[PDB]
Design a protein around this ligand. Structure first.
Ligand code: ZN
Length: 29
């Protein structure tokens, strides 16, 4: 599933990758 990173402008299709990706973005867990 297309997962757009509003911060980067990019987009994934894998939940874990984008989640861990936004985890770094958010600074949270
Ligand atoms: Zn990003």
């Amino acid at each position: 599933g297309p997962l757009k990173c509003r911060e980067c402008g990019k987009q994934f299709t894998t939940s874990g990758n984008l989640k861990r990706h936004l985890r770094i973005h958010s600074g949270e867990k």
